[PDB]
Design an enzyme around this catalytic site. Sequence first.
Site, PDB file in Angstrom:
ATOM      1  N   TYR A  66       0.811  -1.214   0.000  1.00 30.47           N
ATOM      2  CA  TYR A  66       0.000   0.000   0.000  1.00 30.47           C
ATOM      3  C   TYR A  66       0.850   1.272   0.000  1.00 30.47           C
ATOM      4  CZ  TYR A  66       0.945   0.029   5.035  1.00 30.47           C
ATOM      5  OH  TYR A  66       1.564   0.031   6.260  1.00 30.47           O
ATOM      6  N   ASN A 111       9.848  -5.314   8.012  1.00 35.80           N
ATOM      7  CA  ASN A 111      10.495  -4.053   8.398  1.00 35.80           C
ATOM      8  C   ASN A 111      11.874  -4.372   8.947  1.00 35.80           C
ATOM      9  OD1 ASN A 111       7.413  -2.759   9.870  1.00 35.80           O
ATOM     10  ND2 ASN A 111       8.128  -2.675   7.756  1.00 35.80           N
ATOM     11  N   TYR A 113      15.140  -2.606  10.676  1.00 29.07           N
ATOM     12  CA  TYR A 113      15.543  -1.390  11.392  1.00 29.07           C
ATOM     13  C   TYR A 113      17.033  -1.322  11.662  1.00 29.07           C
ATOM     14  CZ  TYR A 113      10.574  -0.897  12.481  1.00 29.07           C
ATOM     15  OH  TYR A 113       9.214  -0.763  12.386  1.00 29.07           O
ATOM     16  N   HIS A 122       0.982   5.466  14.873  1.00 34.26           N
ATOM     17  CA  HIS A 122       0.032   5.143  13.816  1.00 34.26           C
ATOM     18  C   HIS A 122      -0.904   4.041  14.215  1.00 34.26           C
ATOM     19  CE1 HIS A 122       2.879   1.882  13.249  1.00 34.26           C
ATOM     20  NE2 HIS A 122       1.963   1.267  12.482  1.00 34.26           N
ATOM     21  N   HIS A 184       0.160   2.879  18.011  1.00 34.64           N
ATOM     22  CA  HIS A 184       1.414   2.268  18.449  1.00 34.64           C
ATOM     23  C   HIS A 184       2.591   2.859  17.726  1.00 34.64           C
ATOM     24  CE1 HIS A 184       0.120  -0.496  15.164  1.00 34.64           C
ATOM     25  NE2 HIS A 184       1.430  -0.628  14.900  1.00 34.64           N
ATOM     26  N   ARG A 195      17.115  -4.710  14.250  1.00 30.60           N
ATOM     27  CA  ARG A 195      15.903  -5.435  14.601  1.00 30.60           C
ATOM     28  C   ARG A 195      15.068  -5.571  13.341  1.00 30.60           C
ATOM     29  NH1 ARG A 195      10.224  -3.904  15.705  1.00 30.60           N
ATOM     30  NH2 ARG A 195       9.379  -5.745  16.797  1.00 30.60           N
TER      31      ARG A 195
HETATM   32 MN   LIG Z   1       1.838  -1.021  12.753  1.00 32.26          MN
END
Ligand SMILES: [Mn+2]
Length: 210
Positions: A66, A111, A113, A122, A184, A195
């Site tokens: 998205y 994700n 990091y 968000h 969160h 991470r």
């Molecule tokens: Mn999230």
Amino acid sequence: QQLQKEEEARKVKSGIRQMRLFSQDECAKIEARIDEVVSRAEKGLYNEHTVDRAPLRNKYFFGEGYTPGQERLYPPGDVDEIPEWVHQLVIQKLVEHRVIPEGFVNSAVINDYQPGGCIVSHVDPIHIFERPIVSVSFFSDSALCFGCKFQFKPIRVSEPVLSLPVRRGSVTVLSGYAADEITHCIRPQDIKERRAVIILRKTRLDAPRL
Ligand SMILES: [Mn+2]
């Protein structure tokens, strides 16, 4: 005010389930596969919308991807398919442990990091994704915060409503209040080393498309 903080934390916990599901060796195998994804992206082997590069965090979208509140799903086939290893090493384990049913997951996001990386307050887009939302953590231990007003108003409110430890190999399942009624985020001080997280979700039938 103190009672309100505790009640809100109770409400958040009602929508969180967490279990240590992946062993040291299982994490190591998955981490090797995550490294392969990073390498493939650098070789230019993925579609444009599969890879989102940002300073302290890369996002890799598989199955569905998205583009606040006006997120749109990319047209079918714009992002790369969910890798076989994600089915075999991650989703299979979740299904066998009755975390989610077979066939639920059609979106896998990774994700990755850097130290000092973070995510700003968000809500997982309610028009895009069904609940529950499942996330599995990999390279190190960190914390996931709920109620993120503090990222914007540090004098008025210093801390999140709730901080949830997210250990390597841990599976976090978000639903109800924790998924829909509170924000969160991740604080940069909580990511001291690399991470990664694999987020497994189902997109809604009427998720608006581009
Ligand atoms: Mn999230």
